[PDB]
Amino acid sequence: MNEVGYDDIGGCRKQMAQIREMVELPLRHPQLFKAIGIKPPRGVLMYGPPGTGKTLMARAVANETGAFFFLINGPEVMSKMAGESESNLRKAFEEAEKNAPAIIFIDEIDSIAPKRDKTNGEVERRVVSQLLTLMDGMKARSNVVVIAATNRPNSIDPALRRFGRFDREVDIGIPDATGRLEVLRIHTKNMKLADDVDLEALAAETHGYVGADIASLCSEAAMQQIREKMDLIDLDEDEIDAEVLDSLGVTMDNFRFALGNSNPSALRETVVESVNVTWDDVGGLDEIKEELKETVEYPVLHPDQYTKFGLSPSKGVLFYGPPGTGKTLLAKAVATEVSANFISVKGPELLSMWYGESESNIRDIFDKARAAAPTVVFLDELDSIAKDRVVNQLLTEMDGMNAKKNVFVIGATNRPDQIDPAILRPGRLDQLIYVPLPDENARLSILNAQLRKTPLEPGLELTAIAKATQGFSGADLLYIVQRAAKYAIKDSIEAHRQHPVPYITKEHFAEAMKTAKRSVSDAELRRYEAYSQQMKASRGQ
């Protein structure tokens, strides 16, 4: 089937706009580049998690442009008899050239131009050389745009990423809540949905799902509805009752069951994501909030002042403090303020990179950060690695960056002494910041925020609980509220079984807090404070 217009896409305004401004104008309005006398870029390389719609984007752009389209699949081209792949490539390219304007989509290019390390096969070398020769010779040709789709940027051969080749790069990230809502609406434009559908609620619940996974979710929900209504349908009879066939209707419980039986995998690797956390779900640390605002917002939102004064913006920041203090939320808020993408790299990912068993690599992470700039790279629990190949690679990557690009590296840890002294030199993660435990007002704000999604008995003031939880990390308060909810649900289920309990009660909170604990021991807090004092004395003239 064809005619997949822009109306069949959602949640990808930025990348679609980039690809459109990069493809349409050279073909639709070549006279502009003649009037301004430049050479429009040819190569375009889209890469992102599998199933994000890269091929769908390419097809939509091709159809909307109304230009000759020629599809080349890496697998099928690599499946031909020896010496036939080169002939197929030469044909495809000549046919595209003769029918200008044209667009070429080399889908899964990584399968025909893999990393030079894994190109031991002679035929692989021949095919890669043929592709390189074809692309190099194409510069004479006009009105021909080549689009390549690959899983990761570090899998293709390095030789394919130079001027005159796939230079322009696009990074596809997982969609946000609005994107997921749009995907659901686009996919569920034909299903016989029931009245009680809350697509907004589904989008809120489903996190980390890519468009393909959402389509699978819709298919599974429809399958669940069919299975439920199968009791009124007999397999033996060839004919199907018209009314029963029409009576089919998808309900919310079907979608929840489909979510239960789903297997998302995009989050398994580092992926660019968008966040919308403001300075409202984070309480306290007002001085730190203001300092981070000054550090990040002004260089991004107000670059003219820095240009006037010649200041060089700080590259990265480092956070240290007791665990459970909300460093990740602070980083997300910082990313939100500058309205930039966010990349997260937990410690197990760093260990996997150290052992070289995960596909992704530090170089790939920073390449994706550059492609999706502005971004915010977040390195959690660095102390797990700064106990070094990985550290040296990270230092080289950090030193070799364009200061103008808005790439900020934010490191989190609990052992600032255990971090390598090299990482703290100027031009690197030198700006230290301590994250103290929440104060009474901070604890009250955290409790109130965490309870916005749970009914409460009227008059249940949390001030007493906040005051009775001095020195408690936010995670401990989350645990206390979770325990109270568990007690309440247990009581509700018991009452129902013996049969009431529509909301939590104060006595539930009292019982839950009767068995609470302080996550951080006093000795660790003393050492943290001692190190903070030591750092202050070194900058406290």
Partner 1 sequence: TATAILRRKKRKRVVRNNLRINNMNEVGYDDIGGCRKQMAQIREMVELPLRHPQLFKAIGIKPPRGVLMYGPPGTGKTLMARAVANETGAFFFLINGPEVMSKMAGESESNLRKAFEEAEKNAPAIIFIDEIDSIAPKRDKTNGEVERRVVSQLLTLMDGMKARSNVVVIAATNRPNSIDPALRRFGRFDREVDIGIPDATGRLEVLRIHTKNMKLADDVDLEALAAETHGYVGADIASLCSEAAMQQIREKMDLIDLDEDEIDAEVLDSLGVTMDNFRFALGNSNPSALRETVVESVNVTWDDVGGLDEIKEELKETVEYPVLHPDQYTKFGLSPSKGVLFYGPPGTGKTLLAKAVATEVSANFISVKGPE
Ligand X SMILES: Nc1ncnc2c1ncn2[C@@H]1O[C@H](COP(=O)(O)OP(=O)(O)O)[C@@H](O)[C@H]1O
Ligand Y SMILES: Nc1ncnc2c1ncn2[C@@H]1O[C@H](COP(=O)(O)OP(=O)(O)OP(=O)(O)O)[C@@H](O)[C@H]1O
Please state, in angstroms and rounded to a whole number, the distance separating the CA atoms of residues 317 and 509: 38
Residue 541 found at the interface with a copy of itself (CB under 8 A): no
3-state secondary structure of 227: helix
Q: At what angle do helices 252-260 and 211-229 cross, to 10 degrees?
A: 120
Judged by CB under 8 A, the residue of 10, 11, 51, 324 near partner 1 is: 51
Residue 228 binds which entry of partner 1, ligand X, a copy of itself, none, with Cβ cut-offs from 5 to 8 Å by kind?
Answer: partner 1
Size of the site for ligand Y (CB under 6 A): 20
Handedness of CA 269, 275, 281, 285 (dihedral sign): positive
The footprint of partner 1 on residues 188-227 (CB under 8 A) is: 190-192, 212, 215-216, 218-219, 222-223, 225-227
> Which partner in ligand X, ligand Y, partner 1, none is near 114 (CB below 5 to 8 A by kind)?
none
Asked whether position 333 contacts ligand X by CB under 6 A, the answer is no
Q: Give yes or no for residue 498 binding partner 1 (CB under 8 A).
A: no
Of residues 458-517, those binding ligand X (CB under 6 A): 474-475, 478
- 54 is an annotated ligand-binding site residue: yes
Strand-pair category, 431-434 with 68-73: unpaired
Whether residue 383 contacts residue 419, with contact meaning beta carbons closer than 8 Å, is answered with yes
Residues 509-538 that bind a copy of itself (CB under 8 A): none
Identify which range of 245-253, 327-335, 381-389, 392-400 contacts partner 1 by CB under 8 A.
Answer: 245-253
The helix (H) or strand (E) run that includes residue 33 is helix 30-36
Question: Mask of contacts with ligand Y, 143-182, x by CB under 6 A?
Answer: ------x---------------------------------
Q: Which does 121 bind (CB under 5 to 8 A by kind): ligand Y, ligand X, partner 1, none?
A: partner 1
Least Cα distance to 519 among 479, 472, 481, 461 occurs for 472
Burial class (CB in 10 A: 0-12, 13-18, 19+), 366: buried
63 is in an annotated binding site: no
If one counts every other C-beta atom within 10 angstroms of the C-beta of residue 460, the result is 15
Half-sphere exposure of 449 (CA within 13 A, CB side): 17
Contact between 428 and ligand X per CB under 6 A: no
Please give the Cα distance from 57 to 274 (Å, whole number).
20
Give the DSSP letter string of 341-364.
Answer: EEEEE-HHHHHHHHHT-SS--HHH
Q: Which is nearer to partner 1, 198 or 417 (CB)?
A: 198
Question: Phi and psi at residue 311, in whole multiples of 5°?
Answer: -65, 145
Residue 151 marked ligand-binding: yes
325 is in an annotated binding site: yes
- Give me the amino acid identity at 272: V
Nearer CB in complex with ligand X: 138/285:
285
Binder of ligand X out of 194, 329, 351, 456 (CB under 6 A): 329
Binding stretches for partner 1 (CB under 8 A) = 50-51, 73, 75-76, 78-81, 111, 120-121, 123-124, 190-192, 212, 215-216, 218-219, 222-223, 225-228, 230-231, 235, 238-240, 245, 248, 250, 256, 453-454, 482, 485-486, 488-490, 492-493, 496
Binding site as annotated, residues: 50-56, 151, 187, 324-329
